Each structure stands twice: as structure tokens, then as C-alpha cells.
Design a protein around this ligand. Structure first.
Ligand SMILES: C[C@H]1CN(C(=O)Cc2ccsc2)CCO1
Ligand SMILES: C[C@H]1CN(C(=O)Cc2ccsc2)CCO1
Lengths: 300, 255
């Protein structure tokens, strides 16, 4: 189990760690988060008490280095940093645990939620979507735009998700216009899976990362990407049986974790009704259809 | 965006544009089978692709053989229409290609947009006007060439005959839409109006009779009356009680 030490908490803030959250008061004796499960990516995120504007946060993997948080009073935010001096790091870390100045990552043993939301999410792929190579962790916030949003403005600060566009020459073979538009199997299987993502695991990891950035930061472009990647599969007549079964599980845990009160803004009514009731896969997503119908019947 | 009454004049500007109407592409007769079930028989159809500024009509004849062995024909017809409009554009020199294509039915938008992805600078637009181009098959010489076709074929017409020598395209389009609206509302009476007079004939290279300017004013009046007459027969309205303001709106409201 790993630890993320905070130099201090000079401003009142709600802190997120994966699907958990807790409040820290202005100048409260908080020195970080302990017992973080090794083996998964994680996200530590922030919403200032005095300005809910800009949720922001950091994707990280404790296996890739020793990371800590320190507030920057000039830039006005909690920043992640890497500590290269391992013995300094272990030393400070031990002092705060001995003083019980850290919150414990609160993983119930029955619970597989975080794994099931991040099964296919890899830090290496995150770092290709979020380009900032000098750091091993990745900053995301509520306002960051996607490369596709910028096509339809600062390129350094963008989310470089894979562009999906159903009315694009990439999606549509000359001569197969009706076929390729009404059945997106070519675009899914040959262009995206074989061509760009190489395998379904990488496709699902992007889908899961887009969902998490939509949920944790209210990032609109991420929400668009999550829905595009679902719709692409649901609108394909030919999908490997194992991908459909995995997608059903992925979506089930996503719908299960979504805060009920954010469903009106995080779920696209058109996409979900199409996917669940009209698409080629309308009968292939049993678990997702059941939780959707019992939890958000309004949306349908 | 969409084309409606606020931007009427854009149709008659110098930016090449075409209307595409797909309402006569997939045509059927419905009949009873020997077993008492119902079946359809396709008949020849046509794409109606019109430049409203010049009158040029690209009439692609859709022979019933294009449907052989196909499923979901009403859906296919939209894509076939789009395929053929795309092929027409690509066949035209660059300086003749349209800047805008206006589809009379919004179901044509995605089919045409997808087929035209290679032409990102051509705008595909809907229209709120209810244009009566379905009545094209009430123009005898168009209906004839469609029903006689034994293979796919493109035929070119000027749907304004020689009118543009004497009137503007805004007036020519107004005359065409009034004629088509009347033929759609009461085809027998409209043809009676157009052909009642033996002394006025249709030139071999024309679609409509050779009316003088004054006779066109008479014909246009008789067509508005036909639209008003049918309007009253339909809704059981005494037309005699109607005021001129009420009439403009009834006739204008049809398109
Ligand atoms: C540089 C600062 C860091 N600080 C911290 O508390 C944050 C920290 C924890 C482990 S590594 C960094 C204490 C004094 O030394
Ligand atoms: C010049 C105008 C003509 N128009 C019409 O529909 C006129 C019309 C209306 C009812 S019977 C005839 C379409 C837009 O352009």
C-alpha cells in the first residue's frame, strides 16, 4: 500500500481519491492519503470550498514514483510533484503516519468497484491522451477541451482522445456509404480496433478514462468521447462476443457508480435509448439495460 | 442551415444550387395476391434535381431493376438518390458543381451528406417550404420518358421552357411552383386548364404550352382559383365569403 504526503492544506478543499471524497478545512492538520492500493491507476482530485469552479486533479500510479501534493499560492492550486530522494520521502511519510495525520484509502474487501472502473486504464495510455511528458502523473480539469472540440484552443492543454466521427471519410468507405453508415462494423473493427487501438483492451481503457474524467471533473468533451465510443460499438452489427460481454460489465459499473443527481447531465438520452432499444446490440447489454431501467427509467 | 420564407431570394442568386426531391424515386402499386394477401409492384421512378435559377432539370430515371433483390426499399431509395446526386456532381466540371444542395425532405440529409463527404465545401440543406415537386410526374412528357425507360437513364430538361427570355427566375420558379401545386391538388382540372384550348400548343422541345404573357396571367389566375376551389371542397368552406388577404394566405400557405 502506497502513500501520497501533502506538505499542508492551506485552503479549504474537498479532496477526491478515486470514488471517495472528504472535506479538509482551511489550515487543517492534513498530511495526505495512505493505504492506496498498489496495482491500479488512481486519481486524486480537488474542488476548492470557496470556488467550486475548476474541479481538477491528477492521474497517477504509485508504482511509477513517489508523489506528493503541495499547495502553490501563486498558481492557486494543489500541485502534484515527484520526490526523487527516496529516503527523504520514506522519512517524511513515516513521521506523518506515526502522527496519524493521513486519511486511509477506504477499500472494503468485498468491493471491486475501482478495479471494475479502471480494468483497462493504463498510465502509459493516459500520458498519451494528456501530453505533459516531463511528469509521470497527468493533470486533468473541468475545462480542458478535446482535440476534436478544438477542430470544431491551446493544443498543449488538450485531451487527445481518439477522434470518432460517424460522418467522416475515415468512418465511411467510398462505395460502401450506406453500408458503413448504417452498420459501423468496418469503422469499429478495421479502422479503430485493428488500425488505431490495436486491441479492444486499449479501446476500453480510453472509454473508461473518458467516463472517469466526465464523472470526476464534469469534463464535457470526455463525456462526448465516452458516449461516442459506446455508440460506435452499439451501432456495429459485427462485434466480438467477448467485447460485448465486457462492454456490458464496464457500463454496468459505470452506471452503478454515477451519482444519481448528476444523471441528467452525464447521460445522453438519445445515445442510451438508441443503444439499448434500437441498435444492433439492443439485446446484448443485459446487465446495463437492467440497471439503467431500474435506476434511471426517466431517461428512457 | 434551413431554407424558408426569410431567404427566398437566395435561390435566384449566382451561387450555383440544386434542389433534390426524392418523392418519386421509389414508386409502387399495391395489389391483392391470389391468396388474398397484399403485395407491391414497383414502377419506374425518377430523381428530380433542379437548378432554380436556370431551370435545368437533371431527371435521373430510376428503373425498377435497381430494386431487384433488395430489402428495405424506402430506406435504400434515399441512399440511391444520394449516390446518383453525388455521381452527377462529380460528373460536372468544377465551375458547374453546386455550392449548395437543398433537399425537400429531411430524411435525405444524412444520405446525401455521407455521399458528399468528398465535397466538404458543398452545403447540404433542408428547407421548411413544402415544395410540390412530387407533381413532376403530372407533366406528361416527364411521366412518358420515365414509364418508357427500359434501363437507367438521365434526361435533361429545362423545366422553364423559354420563360427566362421574358421573366426573371424568381417569377419562373413562382409560376412553376403554382403549376405543380395545382397539378398536385387537382390534376384533372389543372390539365384541363392548361390544355383546354386547342389553339395553344406545346412545342416539341417544351414541357408547357406556348402561352403569351397575357394568357399566362389568365392561366395563373385559373390555377389560384383551382387551389382555392379545392381548398373549399376539402374543408367545406364557402370560398365566396373569403377576402383577398385570406386567399393570398391560403394559396401561399400551401407551399
Ligand atoms: C520539501 C518539503 C516537503 N514537505 C512535505 O511535507 C511534502 C513531502 C512529503 C514527502 S516528500 C515531500 C516537508 C518538508 O520538505
Ligand atoms: C419565388 C418563390 C416561389 N415559391 C412558392 O412556393 C410560390 C407559390 C406558393 C403557392 S403556389 C406558388 C417558393 C419560393 O420561391
Amino acid at each position: 500500500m502506497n502513500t501520497v504526503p501533502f506538505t499542508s492544506a492551506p485552503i479549504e478543499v474537498t479532496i477526491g481519491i478515486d470514488q471517495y471524497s472528504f472535506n479538509v478545512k482551511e489550515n487543517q492538520p492534513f498530511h495526505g492519503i495512505k493505504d492506496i492500493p498498489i496495482g491500479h491507476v488512481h486519481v486524486i482530485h480537488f474542488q476548492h470550498a470557496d470556488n467550486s469552479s475548476m474541479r481538477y486533479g491528477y492521474w497517477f500510479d504509485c508504482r511509477m514514483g513517489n508523489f506528493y501534493i503541495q499547495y502553490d499560492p501563486k498558481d492557486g492550486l494543489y500541485k502534484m510533484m515527484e520526490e526523487r530522494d527516496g529516503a527523504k520521502f520514506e522519512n517524511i511519510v513515516h513521521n506523518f503516519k506515526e502522527r496519524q495525520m493521513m486519511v486511509s484509502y477506504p477499500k472494503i474487501d468485498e468491493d471491486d468497484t475501482w478495479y471494475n472502473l479502471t480494468e483497462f486504464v493504463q498510465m502509459d495510455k493516459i500520458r498519451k491522451i494528456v501530453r505533459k511528458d516531463e511528469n509521470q502523473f497527468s493533470y486533468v480539469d473541468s475545462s480542458m477541451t478535446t482535440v476534436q472540440e478544438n477542430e470544431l484552443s491551446d493544443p498543449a492543454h488538450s485531451l487527445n482522445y481518439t477522434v470518432i466521427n460517424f460522418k467522416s471519410r475515415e468512418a465511411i468507405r467510398p462505395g460502401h456509404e450506406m453500408e458503413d453508415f448504417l452498420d459501423k462494423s468496418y469503422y469499429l473493427n478495421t479502422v479503430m480496433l485493428q488500425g488505431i487501438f490495436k486491441n479492444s483492451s486499449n479501446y476500453f481503457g480510453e472509454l473508461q478514462f473518458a467516463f472517469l474524467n466526465a464523472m470526476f471533473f464534469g469534463n464535457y468533451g470526455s463525456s462526448l468521447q465516452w458516449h461516442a465510443m459506446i455508440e460506435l460499438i452499439c451501432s456495429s452489427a459485427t462485434v466480438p462476443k467477448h467485447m460485448l460481454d465486457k462492454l456490458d460489465e464496464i457500463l454496468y459499473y459505470q452506471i452503478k457508480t454515477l451519482p444519481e443527481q448528476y444523471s441528467d447531465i452525464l447521460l445522453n438520452e438519445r445515445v442510451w435509448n438508441i443503444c439499448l432499444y434500437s441498435s444492433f446490440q439492443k439485446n446484448s447489454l443485459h446487465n446495463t439495460e437492467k440497471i439503467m431501467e431500474n435506476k434511471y427509467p426517466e431517461l428512457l | 442551415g434551413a431554407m424558408n420564407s426569410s431567404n427566398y431570394a437566395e435561390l435566384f442568386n449566382n451561387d450555383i444550387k440544386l434542389f433534390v426531391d426524392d418523392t418519386n424515386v421509389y414508386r409502387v402499386t399495391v395489389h391483392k395476391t391470389f391468396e388474398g394477401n397484399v403485395a407491391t409492384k414497383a414502377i419506374n421512378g425518377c430523381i428530380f434535381t433542379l437548378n432554380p435559377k436556370t431551370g435545368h432539370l437533371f431527371l435521373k430515371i430510376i428503373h425498377t431493376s435497381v430494386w431487384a433483390g433488395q430489402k428495405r426499399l424506402s430506406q435504400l431509395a434515399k441512399w440511391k438518390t444520394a449516390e446518383e446526386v453525388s455521381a452527377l456532381v462529380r460528373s460536372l466540371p468544377k465551375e458547374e458543381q453546386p455550392k449548395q444542395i437543398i433537399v425537400t425532405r429531411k430524411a435525405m440529409l444524412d444520405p446525401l451528406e455521407v455521399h458528399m463527404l468528398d465535397f466538404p465545401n458543398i452545403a447540404i440543406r433542408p428547407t421548411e417550404l413544402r415544395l410540390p415537386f412530387s407533381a413532376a410526374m403530372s407533366i406528361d412528357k416527364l411521366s412518358d420518358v420515365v414509364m418508357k425507360a427500359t434501363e437507367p437513364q438521365m434526361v435533361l430538361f429545362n423545366i422553364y421552357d423559354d420563360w427566362l427570355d421574358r421573366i426573371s427566375s424568381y417569377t419562373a420558379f413562382s409560376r412553376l411552383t403554382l403549376l405543380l401545386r395545382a397539378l398536385k391538388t387537382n390534376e384533372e382540372s389543372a390539365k384541363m386548364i392548361l390544355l383546354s384550348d386547342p389553339t395553344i400548343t406545346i412545342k416539341s422541345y417544351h414541357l408547357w404550352p406556348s402561352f403569351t404573357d397575357e394568357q399566362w396571367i389568365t392561366i395563373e389566375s385559373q390555377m389560384r382559383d383551382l387551389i382555392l376551389t379545392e381548398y373549399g371542397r376539402k374543408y367545406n368552406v364557402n370560398i365566396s365569403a373569403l377576402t383577398q388577404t385570406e386567399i393570398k394566405d391560403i394559396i401561399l400557405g400551401q407551399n
